[PDB]
Design a protein around this nucleic acid. Structure first.
Ligand SMILES: CC[C@H]1OC(=O)[C@H](C)[C@@H](O[C@@H]2C[C@@](C)(OC)[C@@H](O)[C@H](C)O2)[C@H](C)[C@@H](O[C@@H]2O[C@H](C)C[C@H](N(C)C)[C@H]2O)[C@@](C)(O)C[C@@H](C)C(=O)[C@H](C)[C@@H](O)[C@@]1(C)O
Length: 49
RNA sequence: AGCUGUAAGUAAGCUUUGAUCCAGAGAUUUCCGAAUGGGGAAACCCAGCAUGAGUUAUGUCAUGUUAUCGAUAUGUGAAUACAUAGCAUAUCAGAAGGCACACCCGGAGAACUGAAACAUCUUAGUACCCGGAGGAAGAGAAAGAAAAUUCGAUUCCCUUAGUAGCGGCGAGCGAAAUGGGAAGAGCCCAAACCAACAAGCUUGCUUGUUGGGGUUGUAGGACACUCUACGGAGUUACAAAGGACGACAUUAGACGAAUCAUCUGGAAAGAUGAAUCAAAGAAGGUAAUAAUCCUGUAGUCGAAAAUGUUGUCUCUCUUGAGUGGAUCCUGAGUACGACGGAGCACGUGAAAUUCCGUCGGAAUCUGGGAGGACCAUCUCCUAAGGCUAAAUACUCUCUAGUGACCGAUAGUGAACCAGUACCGUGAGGGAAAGGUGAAAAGCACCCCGGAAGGGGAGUGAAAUAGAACCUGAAACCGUGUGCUUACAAGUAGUCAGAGCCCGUUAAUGGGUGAUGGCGUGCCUUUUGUAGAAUGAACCGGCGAGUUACGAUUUGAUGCAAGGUUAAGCAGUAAAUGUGGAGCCGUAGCGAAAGCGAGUCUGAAUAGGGCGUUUAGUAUUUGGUCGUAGACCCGAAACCAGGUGAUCUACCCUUGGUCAGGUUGAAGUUCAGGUAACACUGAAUGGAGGACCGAACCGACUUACGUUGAAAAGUGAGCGGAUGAACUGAGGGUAGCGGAGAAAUUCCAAUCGAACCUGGAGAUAGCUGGUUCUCUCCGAAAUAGCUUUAGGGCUAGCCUCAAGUGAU
RNA sequence: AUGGUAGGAGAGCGUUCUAAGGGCGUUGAAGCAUGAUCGUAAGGACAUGUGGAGCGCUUAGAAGUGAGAAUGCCGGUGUGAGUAGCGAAAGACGGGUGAGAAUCCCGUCCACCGAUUGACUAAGGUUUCCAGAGGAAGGCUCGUCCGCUCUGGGUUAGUCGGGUCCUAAGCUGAGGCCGACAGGCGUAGGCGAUGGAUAACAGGUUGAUAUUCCUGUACCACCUAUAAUCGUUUUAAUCGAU
RNA sequence: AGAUAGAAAAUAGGUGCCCGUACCGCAAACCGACACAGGUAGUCAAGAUGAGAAUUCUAAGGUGAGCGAGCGAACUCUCGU
RNA sequence: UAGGCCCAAGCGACUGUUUAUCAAAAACACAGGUCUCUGCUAAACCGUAAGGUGAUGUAUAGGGGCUGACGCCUGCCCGGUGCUGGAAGGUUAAGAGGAGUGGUUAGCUUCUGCGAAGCUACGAAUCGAAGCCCCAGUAAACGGCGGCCGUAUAACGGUCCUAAGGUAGCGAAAUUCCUUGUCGGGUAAGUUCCGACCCGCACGAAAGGCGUAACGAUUUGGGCACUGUCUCAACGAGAGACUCGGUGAAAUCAUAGUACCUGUGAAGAUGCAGGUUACCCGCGACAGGACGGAAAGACCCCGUGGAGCUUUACUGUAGCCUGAUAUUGAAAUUCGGCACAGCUUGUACAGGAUAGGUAGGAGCCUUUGAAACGUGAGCGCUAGCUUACGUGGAGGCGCUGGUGGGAUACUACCCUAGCUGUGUUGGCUUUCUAACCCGCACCACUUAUCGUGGUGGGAGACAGUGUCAGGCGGGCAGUUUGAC
RNA sequence: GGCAUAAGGGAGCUUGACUGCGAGACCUACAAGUCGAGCAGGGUCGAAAGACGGACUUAGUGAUCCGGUGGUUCCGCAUG
């Protein structure tokens, strides 16, 4: 998903995205240590490096 | 017992050994198209490998095979020593990719429009862009909702109610609680236990693995207490009986009713006389209208995959073993919240569900935790930790079988040659034309000009019934005959009369055609029109008032102390019957609590407002409003998805072309004046967005063309003509864009923003139209206000209907 | 005593069916189109044509109901004129053929284009090419030609032009990068002529093809036999790079 | 390099696939609704005259124009005095 | 078949380009100027991004703006706006801190507020960067270069206001209203033309001024040649006119046999209604009707009908700057928390015997020592004030009493501080590397510079990216532009 | 338009610059706009009858949202 509005003071609307905070890091996927994008929230408590 | 599709007639065969047909099963199935050997401008070109045939051999041909990620076993394994990747294999090719985008779930998501734009809001989470599955999903056996005394594991589809609420409190949007149909079907990780394995470890333990155990607690288990199992049995699921599993349908289907004869035009199916046999007896199609020719309807037997699918249905179930909840377990970046937003009827906020980014950080029996602002009581969970049921959606046309229906400007654009002629570069747009049979019997035969006629001829119950056998009509228009009719000034008619006729569906009938008076449309729009205001020959598909469904005002009644049905169910797609989990009147008043023939106001019980002093609807059914898009036709334009650089503008790569003349740059070199060669005379040389001028390229004047030869041309002159020249082939840039020596110029005869489809019947306070009836009688026409003023609303002037009744 | 584009309550007709009743009808029954009736209607009961098998009346109900214009649409039809025009250029006569000739064929003379109105090759078009025979239409006539019919047909390559070669601009592109999706970009590599590479000329011959067919003379490749020659197969003229 | 013996050559034999090919083609056959005075890349191009591919006439080769044709004012258009 | 020429002015240097289809020009280009941006993964531009152009370039280069060969030149104003820079003056949002306050509660009297412990809604003392404000510069940046009375800053005087009021050269001009201005030349006659004047409505110096050889299908004036252009006819061909034809269309479909004469219709007249004239029908020769059309007027209105374009119209936004946070680490320096607890003087007419900027302070310290005397902190104009005391000993004081203009008993506590180390908390600036990032170099996969890995180098907790905040934002959008 | 019934100056004060209605009150499309009696119900001036619900009369201004006060009569997230 992750679209929605930007709203003005007179309450106009323009469509707009919210992007995740992807950072490129080297994780240990199956086999090699590989570089990949993953969000900062996801490596808060999800996945080893 | 005939047959050789449509798209007809021979040779023909079949063949009683059963043709042609009709069902079922198989076999063959070129080439292209995810196309997948490689390539490509689909339907073509070019290969390899392995067999095989051929060949003295090649060449040639035939048959197989050769496009990425998963699984089995692996193997090798550069920068860098092994490893593992990767890698190259061998196999199943496994599996991707096939969609009526009608229903469904997701992602992303306009706009014209409404408000008398709108920008909040609405249109609308709509179009249709993309992705999924599919005969669904979601949900779910609950931090589940319900808030009375709860409740229905759920769950999903037809009452409350246009209510509560939301809302530039505008336009508008718009619930749920309290139930019918259908109906439950329960699984995990967690706790400890146990048994093996290995590893660490020092064989103790721990780690982990495999398995039984258990999924809700005002407790489940180790336990701790205590003593039962195939009792029931069960397949849509966890044990399946997979079973002989006991009817798929009794489905292909096919056989299989029963009547009828006579007289007058072809025949009876008009008048006589008869009949039909029971589950059919019922409709409906055939030179004549057979509930009794084709046939069904009834009956019959019924075969492949069938087996109603069951009442033992092998295996095999699960008889539950009762107390406590005391200690452990009950799910992690999480409950849990800030900040931006979205969805919830609700305009984000005082928010109970979701997204991004950041925070962080619980608890355990003295459990904790959760529920449209906080603390105590009620319901819930043992959320997040997880799941998965059926009944529950929906029909291109699938398939078959059927109807105040399409009756063929038709359900269809197309019941015929139809997505075809044709049009467009392409996306795309898109017609016209339909119609024996009684039987071709289609004019043998025969006679005069090719076509076409005139005769006979005919199957011809009837060819002015001749290829226009669907016949077949009209009108416009015709054209050839004739009866009457010829000094004039014309809304062509009408009211006043010599010649010629003569009468049906019958009686001042039926007329026909000559003279003096008088003389303006469907029409529309107007103060006013007949045009010098608009628009117009004939015919016609053929061309301008439903309901979802509401509101309000004008017949009959259950039937009036009174109101039930909506859905549902049973019935032939009817009537009808049934239907209280269910829905207007009999009472009003107040903002409300509340009171009640009254009540509000008032601190009053006061006045005064609004009521009382009977009539409604289960009602159902005949004019006007509302929502629909709403009497019809017509914009300029907006948005979304696509198609276009074969024209033209730039550019890229690679090619080509330019008669002939003239001038004579830089440079060189000799010599008149020549001597400190030196200036300037001559030879040479061949430069240039040089000059004149053909081909080629342009387009300044003019004439001609202007229903042109031509949707930009011809004649005569004219500018450029070795360059910032001209030109071919193949490429590239695309519309919220491109290109532009710049003109609002060009992007397929189009451009202050192309073309096609769609939203889309956009919107149109403006213009035009608005018909077969005829009613009869009856109203006419200004003040006031106006995000808006040639429009609108209320009053006036109204018709119609009731009423009081001197007004 | 008795008008009104806006007004209310009115009696009626074309299509259809119920829902009926009752009729006209295969010695004929239509309807429809031409007939004296009904009439304000709309709408129906007896002489030609039609056919040749379909309709009315009565009562009631339902409306693809409801027919002069909208610069309306068209199955569409047909008018309004012997008018405008017939699209640049030189023809004349004789013969022939024929149902019929300013037109077709043959002849002679004359004329026009001549850096082209000539001759080749591309693109493009796709049977128009060539013979016969009728052209019902076609052609700004006729047929007594082709651009309708029948076939009789008719297109021949080692060397010509393309593919089994090479690459440019571009276009695609395994792995890779990016991106709500769809998708965009891009590496080796592929594809891609307008360029590079590559072997044939003279004569004869048909109604219709020709560097293709035939005749002569050549040239270029590939394969198999044929022989002397090079003879560590390293090297060696040969092989020969990845 | 490397690799094999090892060649080739010159003769004699065989063998040589696929696609195009007709016709129009600066036009009656292409693009232009048309048998339309337009547009359409390249090659060849004889004699006289001339500098010339200019001009005028002509060879070769093509064609008599393509349905329209026969008679004889105003006016209009092209042309000459 | 094959250039007409000469004299004179405008504009533009030139060849070139342009509105396919009414404009070829004086408009565009141009070679030259000049300004400005940009140190290389350049700026600029396209794209959501990746990629890419610039450029296989590197300040003698590249992008943007204005001017437009050449020659002589290019004056004044930096107040206003824009751009640049600086001092940094002040001001702030998201944020961090936590002084304090409400809301609940056994909590406390139980007729009642230490809100205590905790839970909750707040909250200021603050700090916090851009922008904004200020100051300087810049006019081949945007712009401006005068009113006023004297009088057509014309003369020169006055002002006015911010900043200045037009230098050269031109000048009735492609610019002049009055206006055909006036005078001369050219002609018989000159509104144009040329020369001259200056009273420049309203010329003027890179939206350049003045001049200029050559060039022009440019504009404009005069002359010669020459002519049917004109004063002011014949001939030739084609169309037309007569005949034939394979021939045979088109543009209005009230409809109606359709004179010259009225009044007047929705007033210039068929049918709308007094007189005059006219026998029926054709063929060759033009405009009243149709106020023709194949044209539903192209400068009012509708109707918040459309559309394009502009801006200091309203509302937004692509984007751009700047913060805060996440990715996101380590040590040290400087100092906020513990910096503890912190001390004193300088000089002063005035306490009391003359002290520290100073605050709450009519009040504490007060056997937890208060003032002179041997003497002690720092220091002196030797008065002796603040402080710890044994020989002595109850006071010095203090905001106030103040020759005073403030003030030191308790207490921040001190600039004048210097500082010993302290559990540990949080700023600032450096410096490190492991995050992360190099269109970064060499080396292998490789076939391959894309990419992946190795090694060395650069850079570095920044940048980049995500979320939030704030400023700017006709670059782009939707609208409105009241209404009479 | 009125006005000497003052419709100008003094006293006391005051405070009628009153609370609820309105028996019974005109204009007007609508919405809106224009005076007395009764006592809930209490005053001021007057010796008293009485007069007084602003001024000689007629101009001197406004639904939705928001703020504040007061009653007091609603609400419930499960119940309080
Ligand atoms: C060749 C023939 C062309 O007509 C012309 O060029 C003549 C020469 C025009 O003159 C015009 C003149 C010029 C300026 O137009 C005014 C221009 O518009 C066009 C190009 O040509 C005429 C006469 C114009 O009439 C007049 O138009 C005026 C608006 C009003 C005038 N009258 C009512 C008062 C009216 O008669 C009007 C517009 O063109 C004719 C319209 C209907 C057309 O479109 C006609 C069919 C053209 O297409 C036609 C083929 O092209």
């Amino acid at each position: 998903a992750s679209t929605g509005n930007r709203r003005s003071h007179a309450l106009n609307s323009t469509k707009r995205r919210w992007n995740a905070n992807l950072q490129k890091v080297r994780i240990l996927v199956d086999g090699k240590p590989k570089k990949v994008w993953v969000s900062a929230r996801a490596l808060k408590s999800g996945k080893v490096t």
